[PDB]
Amino acid sequence: QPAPAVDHSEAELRDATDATGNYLAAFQSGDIEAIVGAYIDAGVDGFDPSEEAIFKAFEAARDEATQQLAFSAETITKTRESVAYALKVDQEATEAYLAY
Amino acid sequence: TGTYNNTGGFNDADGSTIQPAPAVDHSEAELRDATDATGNYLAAFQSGDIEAIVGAYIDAGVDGFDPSEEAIFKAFEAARDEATQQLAFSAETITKTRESVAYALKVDQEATEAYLAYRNALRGAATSINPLIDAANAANRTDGSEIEIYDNIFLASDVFTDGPLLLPAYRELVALQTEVNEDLEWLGEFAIDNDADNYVQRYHIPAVEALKAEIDARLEAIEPLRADSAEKNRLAQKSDVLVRQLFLERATAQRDTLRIVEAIFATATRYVELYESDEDVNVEGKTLREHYFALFPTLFGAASFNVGVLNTADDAVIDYYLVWDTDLETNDEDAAYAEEKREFALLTYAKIFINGQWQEKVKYVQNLDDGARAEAARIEAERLADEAYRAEQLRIAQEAADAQKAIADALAK
Amino acid sequence: LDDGARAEAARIEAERLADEAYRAEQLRIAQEAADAQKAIADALAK
Amino acid sequence: ATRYVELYESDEDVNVEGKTLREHYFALFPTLFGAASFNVGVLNTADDAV
């Protein structure tokens, strides 16, 4: 993926990264109870113990993880463009200072 | 597609497909009876004694005991069919219990909504009434003997609490209305103006009339909400959701045990059936009938674990049918149902990775079986097809050659 | 392993259907050709 | 986990290498539970640095 020098503010980077870091708090904690409580849906008020509902819940969790991965993919390009702009600006600044 | 052996995925004959659960009231006595109708079947199996098991689940037969293998096979087949039917019934028990739970949740949800609405109406009436009471009290010049000094409403039952009692407040409001109507009539007397120390002025009557009008306007709107709150709070007291959750857990454990019971009976039936049979092919350096015999040691531990779970599931229901710690502080609470549902869901999730250990072995042996049985037909089918094709080809070629000889003889003439 | 098994459990069916269609077409063509030969036989024998 | 649950009593659960297809999926968890531990150990420092 290309990375043109486009200024994305560091606050934007922090917000976009924290939007994903909240998803991983339960996983990073390591407790299985927290994981099953957060990433798995309980379902209907009457808990169905059949395997089909379990399969559906796991499929939904997998789809949610896939979408989160898709967003974390674009976060990389955003940050790379920000870095390129941050390099270009002070390169030009130091060139001008040397000339003066 | 559904049988004791199937290749169609999830089956409703075992309790694995999806089923709706509308809020329908099935009484807890019905749950207890339907669960005990199955728990009697498992007493011999849960005891663990082999003699009791063979005495209960296996039929002796004719008075003259036939020791031939065919009678043994028939008895095992009958036991397997009985276990299959018991599993089919334990399947529907689950849906019954789930519907009962849904109804038990709906009723007290509505009850607590009505209670909140009625309490809010009472709070609004309390907010609206007091300033007029103070205004009417300020404009009194009598001695205070017959027309007494009013007191602030709800002196004992604090309505501003979240969950207080609400009947004494209504009775106090009714008593205040009665007192106002009583004291209003003495304002129409002719000798009430006794002396300077006690008499009436011009502005007392309008204040009393305004207070009475406000009370009469508030009660007319208060009444239906009180009626609905009482009616809905009485109905929600006739159903508990915790015992239904316990029954659901017990029935799930019963179905889990019935699964392995049916598996054991089917394994024994198939092992007995393959005695000196043409279909007893040899694979993986062993005979097909040998493979079935190795399943028992793992089943005898998986069933032990399932029975250990079912024993606690059974003991829980008997000790907590109607006693405290099953009904709680107030008519509607989800702080206890949520925790039990979480624990039950966690246990259900955890157990799906344990029964699969023996399920996969059973599937492996069964797969070997039907693979051999189905593969020992395609050679015959293809042989018949090839023979028919060759015969038809030869017949067509011969008749074409005859036709060529026919035209030869015809135009040669 | 998974997709190999899943994809391999279709080629036998595909080839069986293709072979059955090929054999049926071959037999039909042979039979109609034999009928045409009988037709010319009856025609020029008349 | 989804695929392991899906293959319950299924027609596509063929047997290979002396084991069932559903059995093969179950053996992946012990290695993932260590690889994810390493990745989480890296991510913890990556988060604390910012």
Coordinates of all heavy atoms in Angstrom, one line a residue, chain A residues 36 40-54 57-58, chain B residues 10 15-18 98 105 248 252 259 337 341 344-346 348-349 352:
Chain A
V36 N -15.4 -15.2 27.7 CA -16.7 -15.8 27.2 C -17.8 -14.8 27.5 O -18.8 -14.8 26.8 CB -16.9 -17.1 27.9 CG1 -15.8 -18.1 27.5 CG2 -17.0 -17.0 29.4
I40 N -18.8 -13.5 23.6 CA -19.8 -14.4 23.2 C -21.2 -13.9 23.8 O -21.3 -13.4 24.9 CB -19.5 -15.8 23.8 CG1 -18.0 -16.2 23.7 CG2 -20.4 -16.9 23.1 CD1 -17.7 -17.5 24.2
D41 N -22.2 -14.0 22.9 CA -23.5 -13.5 23.3 C -24.3 -14.6 24.0 O -24.3 -15.8 23.5 CB -24.3 -13.1 22.0 CG -25.6 -12.5 22.3 OD1 -25.9 -12.1 23.5 OD2 -26.4 -12.4 21.4
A42 N -24.9 -14.3 25.1 CA -25.7 -15.2 25.8 C -26.9 -15.7 25.0 O -27.2 -16.9 25.1 CB -26.2 -14.7 27.1
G43 N -27.6 -14.8 24.3 CA -28.8 -15.2 23.5 C -30.1 -14.9 24.1 O -30.3 -13.9 24.9
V44 N -31.1 -15.7 23.8 CA -32.5 -15.6 24.3 C -32.5 -15.8 25.8 O -31.6 -16.4 26.3 CB -33.4 -16.6 23.5 CG1 -34.8 -16.6 24.1 CG2 -33.4 -16.3 22.0
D45 N -33.5 -15.2 26.4 CA -33.6 -15.3 27.9 C -33.6 -16.7 28.4 O -32.9 -17.0 29.4 CB -34.9 -14.6 28.4 CG -35.1 -13.2 27.7 OD1 -34.5 -12.2 28.2 OD2 -35.8 -13.1 26.7
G46 N -34.3 -17.6 27.6 CA -34.2 -19.0 27.9 C -33.0 -19.6 27.2 O -33.0 -19.8 26.0
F47 N -31.9 -19.9 28.0 CA -30.6 -20.3 27.4 C -30.8 -21.6 26.6 O -31.1 -22.7 27.3 CB -29.6 -20.4 28.4 CG -28.2 -20.8 27.9 CD1 -27.5 -20.0 27.1 CD2 -27.7 -22.1 28.2 CE1 -26.2 -20.3 26.6 CE2 -26.5 -22.5 27.7 CZ -25.7 -21.6 26.9
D48 N -30.6 -21.6 25.3 CA -30.7 -22.8 24.5 C -29.4 -23.6 24.6 O -28.4 -23.0 24.1 CB -31.1 -22.5 23.1 CG -31.4 -23.7 22.2 OD1 -31.1 -24.9 22.7 OD2 -31.8 -23.5 21.1
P49 N -29.4 -24.8 25.1 CA -28.1 -25.6 25.2 C -27.8 -26.4 23.9 O -26.8 -27.1 24.0 CB -28.3 -26.5 26.4 CG -29.8 -26.7 26.4 CD -30.5 -25.5 25.7
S50 N -28.6 -26.3 22.9 CA -28.3 -27.0 21.6 C -27.0 -26.5 21.0 O -26.6 -25.3 21.2 CB -29.5 -26.9 20.7 OG -29.7 -25.6 20.3
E51 N -26.4 -27.4 20.2 CA -25.1 -27.0 19.6 C -25.3 -25.9 18.5 O -24.3 -25.2 18.3 CB -24.5 -28.3 19.0 CG -23.8 -29.2 20.0 CD -24.7 -30.0 20.8 OE1 -25.9 -30.1 20.4 OE2 -24.3 -30.5 21.9
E52 N -26.4 -25.8 17.9 CA -26.6 -24.9 16.8 C -26.5 -23.4 17.3 O -25.8 -22.6 16.7 CB -28.0 -25.1 16.2 CG -28.1 -24.4 14.8 CD -29.2 -25.0 14.0 OE1 -30.3 -25.3 14.5 OE2 -29.0 -25.2 12.8
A53 N -27.0 -23.1 18.5 CA -26.9 -21.8 19.0 C -25.4 -21.5 19.4 O -25.0 -20.3 19.2 CB -27.8 -21.6 20.3
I54 N -24.7 -22.4 19.9 CA -23.3 -22.3 20.2 C -22.5 -22.0 19.0 O -21.7 -21.1 18.9 CB -22.8 -23.5 21.0 CG1 -23.8 -24.1 21.9 CG2 -21.5 -23.2 21.7 CD1 -24.0 -23.2 23.2
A57 N -23.3 -18.4 17.8 CA -22.6 -17.4 18.7 C -21.1 -17.3 18.3 O -20.5 -16.3 18.2 CB -22.7 -17.7 20.1
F58 N -20.4 -18.5 18.1 CA -19.0 -18.5 17.8 C -18.8 -17.9 16.4 O -17.8 -17.2 16.2 CB -18.5 -20.0 17.8 CG -18.2 -20.5 19.2 CD1 -18.6 -21.7 19.6 CD2 -17.5 -19.7 20.1 CE1 -18.3 -22.2 20.9 CE2 -17.2 -20.1 21.3 CZ -17.6 -21.4 21.7
Chain B
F10 N -27.1 -31.8 12.4 CA -27.9 -31.6 13.6 C -29.3 -32.4 13.4 O -29.9 -32.3 12.4 CB -28.2 -30.2 13.8 CG -26.9 -29.4 14.0 CD1 -26.4 -28.5 13.1 CD2 -26.1 -29.5 15.2 CE1 -25.3 -27.8 13.2 CE2 -25.0 -28.8 15.4 CZ -24.5 -27.9 14.4
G15 N -31.9 -33.5 20.3 CA -31.9 -32.3 21.1 C -30.7 -31.4 20.7 O -30.1 -30.8 21.6
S16 N -30.5 -31.3 19.4 CA -29.4 -30.5 18.9 C -29.8 -29.4 17.9 O -29.0 -28.4 17.7 CB -28.3 -31.3 18.2 OG -28.9 -31.9 17.0
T17 N -31.0 -29.4 17.4 CA -31.5 -28.4 16.5 C -32.0 -27.2 17.3 O -32.0 -27.1 18.5 CB -32.6 -28.9 15.6 OG1 -32.9 -28.0 14.5 CG2 -33.8 -29.2 16.4
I18 N -32.4 -26.1 16.5 CA -32.9 -24.9 17.1 C -34.4 -25.0 17.3 O -35.1 -25.7 16.5 CB -32.6 -23.7 16.2 CG1 -32.7 -22.4 17.0 CG2 -33.4 -23.7 15.0 CD1 -31.7 -22.2 18.1
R98 N -37.8 -24.2 29.0 CA -37.4 -22.9 28.5 C -38.6 -21.9 28.4 O -38.5 -20.8 28.7 CB -36.7 -23.0 27.2 CG -35.3 -23.6 27.3 CD -34.6 -23.8 25.9 NE -34.4 -22.5 25.2 CZ -34.9 -22.3 24.0 NH1 -35.6 -23.2 23.3 NH2 -34.6 -21.1 23.4
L105 N -40.2 -14.8 33.5 CA -39.5 -13.5 33.4 C -40.4 -12.4 33.0 O -40.4 -11.3 33.5 CB -38.3 -13.6 32.4 CG -37.1 -14.4 32.9 CD1 -36.0 -14.4 31.8 CD2 -36.5 -13.7 34.2
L248 N -34.4 -27.0 34.3 CA -33.7 -27.0 32.9 C -32.3 -27.6 33.0 O -32.0 -28.4 32.2 CB -33.6 -25.5 32.4 CG -32.9 -25.4 31.1 CD1 -33.5 -26.2 30.0 CD2 -32.9 -23.9 30.6
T252 N -31.2 -31.0 31.1 CA -30.0 -31.1 30.2 C -29.1 -32.2 30.7 O -28.5 -32.9 29.8 CB -29.3 -29.7 30.2 OG1 -29.1 -29.3 31.6 CG2 -30.2 -28.7 29.5
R259 N -27.7 -39.8 26.2 CA -26.9 -39.9 25.0 C -25.9 -41.1 25.1 O -25.9 -41.9 24.3 CB -26.2 -38.6 24.7 CG -26.9 -37.6 23.8 CD -26.2 -36.3 23.8 NE -26.8 -35.4 22.8 CZ -26.4 -34.1 22.7 NH1 -25.5 -33.5 23.5 NH2 -27.0 -33.4 21.7
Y337 N -30.8 -14.2 38.7 CA -31.1 -15.0 37.5 C -29.9 -14.9 36.6 O -29.5 -15.8 35.9 CB -32.3 -14.5 36.8 CG -32.5 -15.2 35.4 CD1 -32.6 -16.5 35.3 CD2 -32.6 -14.4 34.3 CE1 -32.8 -17.1 34.0 CE2 -32.7 -14.9 33.1 CZ -32.9 -16.3 32.9 OH -33.0 -16.8 31.7
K341 N -27.6 -17.9 35.2 CA -27.6 -18.1 33.7 C -26.1 -18.1 33.2 O -25.8 -18.9 32.3 CB -28.4 -17.1 33.0 CG -28.4 -17.2 31.5 CD -29.3 -16.2 30.8 CE -29.4 -16.4 29.3 NZ -30.4 -15.5 28.7
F344 N -24.5 -21.4 34.2 CA -25.1 -22.5 33.4 C -24.5 -22.5 31.9 O -24.2 -23.5 31.4 CB -26.6 -22.5 33.4 CG -27.2 -23.5 32.5 CD1 -26.9 -24.9 32.7 CD2 -28.1 -23.2 31.5 CE1 -27.5 -25.8 31.9 CE2 -28.7 -24.2 30.7 CZ -28.4 -25.5 30.9
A345 N -24.4 -21.3 31.4 CA -23.9 -21.1 30.0 C -22.4 -21.5 30.0 O -21.9 -22.1 29.1 CB -24.1 -19.7 29.5
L346 N -21.7 -21.1 31.0 CA -20.2 -21.5 31.1 C -20.1 -23.0 31.2 O -19.2 -23.5 30.5 CB -19.6 -20.8 32.3 CG -18.1 -21.0 32.5 CD1 -17.3 -20.2 31.4 CD2 -17.6 -20.6 33.9
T348 N -22.2 -25.2 30.1 CA -22.6 -25.8 28.8 C -21.5 -25.6 27.8 O -21.2 -26.5 27.0 CB -23.9 -25.1 28.3 OG1 -25.0 -25.5 29.1 CG2 -24.1 -25.4 26.8
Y349 N -20.8 -24.4 27.8 CA -19.7 -24.2 26.8 C -18.5 -25.2 27.2 O -17.9 -25.7 26.2 CB -19.2 -22.8 26.9 CG -20.2 -21.8 26.3 CD1 -20.5 -20.6 26.9 CD2 -20.8 -22.1 25.0 CE1 -21.4 -19.7 26.3 CE2 -21.7 -21.2 24.5 CZ -21.9 -20.0 25.1 OH -22.8 -19.1 24.5
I352 N -18.9 -29.0 26.1 CA -19.0 -29.4 24.6 C -17.6 -29.8 24.1 O -17.5 -30.4 23.1 CB -19.5 -28.2 23.8 CG1 -20.1 -28.7 22.5 CG2 -18.3 -27.2 23.5 CD1 -20.9 -27.6 21.7

